[model samples]
Target: MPVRRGHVAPQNTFLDTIIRKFEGQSRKFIIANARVENCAVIYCNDGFCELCGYSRAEVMQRPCTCDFLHGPRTQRRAAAQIAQALLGAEERKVEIAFYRKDGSCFLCLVDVVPVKNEDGAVIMFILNFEVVMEK
Candidate 1:
């Protein structure tokens, strides 16, 4: 089962180490980890903060990515896609319109992969996104 929002694997665990490694690599893209159960953000990179125009502290307060990004027009479809990805039914590599903290919006290409455990069960999702176009 996926962990809840704000929950993270132990510091020395394999998953935690992997996340850290990614963080240390070149940071030209937005990378984030969301718990599979609720699609809640567990970790987000500075790229994400820059993209959303939100400080790390403010972004961390959001319960989920959907809450932070989806506006009324984009909410339903985006939620459905995320739900499908969570079920492992599909990979998410869709373009979405996301809101910044200041209410401005931009187009992003969201790519998500499920992070699995040794038993092949999804524990979290790794999301890599880029601003494909700004609007």
Candidate 2:
């Protein structure tokens, strides 16, 4: 072996800075503009793709983050809270129904944070989803 840093190097520097902080793990998440109505996804995380059942290429810049993740049985309480909170650049954490692309639903914890710029303007929101284990 020539050199094994233990972790593979990322080809894009975009994933090197803000994204590298979380490593290649705990992904299942996406970054969306919080200023938009409801909101839309900009950067997509790998965890979001496999767990949410949508391709990164397909969801870019879509309001899918709104009703897209909602199911009839999905709870709107925390979901609505997430929107209003993000609108004010606030953080929110909640446990909601986990709906997969295949129409299967389960329980998961949703943690959201607003990322701002130097001008103190809310740019995007990071929604990290977790599938609660141990039923």
Candidate 3:
């Protein structure tokens, strides 16, 4: 499917395919799926909503997961690492700080992976985060 800026793809179509790919996994982690065109969040699982205290409705259509969740004290190096991984279609694992809805901060291990189409072009990104420390 051709992605367009600000175009929210039908949930039953593109987003569902991505969700189904990971839904069978039994691991406990927060996950966000974003479009490659603008890095706008198309879907976020319940774990993410519970951690950030944002409803799925509120999270959809926003900026990339990190951009929306990272706080002022977030490490620039980690952000750069994630960006490079996304741009290069490589896997990245980093620890970063994020702010919750109540302004509380926590440390999380973030894993980013690019989702590619049959043509080997990156179509979306999946971000998996697990809180490692609370502060």
Candidate 4:
């Protein structure tokens, strides 16, 4: 997500490392989700807003899901993938249909991986998303 006000990259934090490592690889490096927490409480990334039709200010404090992107069906499929990623059991990559804030539907492919602390506990998460024009 784009850095909103009050969010700063920590000089030595994992999120900062991930953002720095991935931010310039390509526009594709941008996460299409409307918001990202822990990494930052940013509202929206530039690509995310452009494709989803929401301004940065519009998604603050709202779960990225406020995009209304996922429903029961998507959740059912996502449950296992998310659990595996969060539990550090797997690195996840998948695609699914999502709802936009305006109630329009779009397809996106997301990649997720957990950030683990020295103790091996998950301390943060990274998500990467791309808009899929078809299938």
Work out the TM-score per prediction: 0.55, 0.63, 0.59, 0.44
Candidate 3 lDDT? 0.60
Ranking by lDDT: 2, 3, 1, 4
Candidate 1, residue 130: CA error in Å?
1.7
What is candidate 2's lDDT per residue for 1-135, written digit by digit as tens?
Answer: 455346676658856765643443755667787777757787877877877687888778875243457765567876676655755545556556666778887655454445667566676676666454555
lDDT of 1 by residue, 1-135 (tens): 475446655657867745643552433133334443455556667776766667767645344445346764455676667666654566555555667677876545554444667666655555554454347
Which pairs in model 1 have colliding backbones? none
lDDT by residue (tens digit), candidate 3, 1-135? 466445666878887765654553432233334345456666667776666676888777665646446787678777777666655545556667777788887655544455567566656665655454347
Alpha-carbon deviation at 41 in model 4, angstroms: 4.1
After TM-score superposition, what is the CA distance of residue 105 in candidate 1 from its true location, in Å?
A: 1.1
lDDT of each: 0.55, 0.64, 0.60, 0.46
Error of 3 at 119 (Å): 7.5
Deviation from native of the Cα of residue 60 in model 3, angstroms:
0.9
Model 2: per-residue Cα lDDT at residue 9: 67
Superposing all C-alpha atoms, what RMSD in Å does each candidate have to the true structure? 9.0, 8.9, 9.6, 10.1
The lDDT of model 2 is 0.64
Clashing pairs in 2: 28-47, 28-48
As for candidate 4, its clashing pairs are 69-99
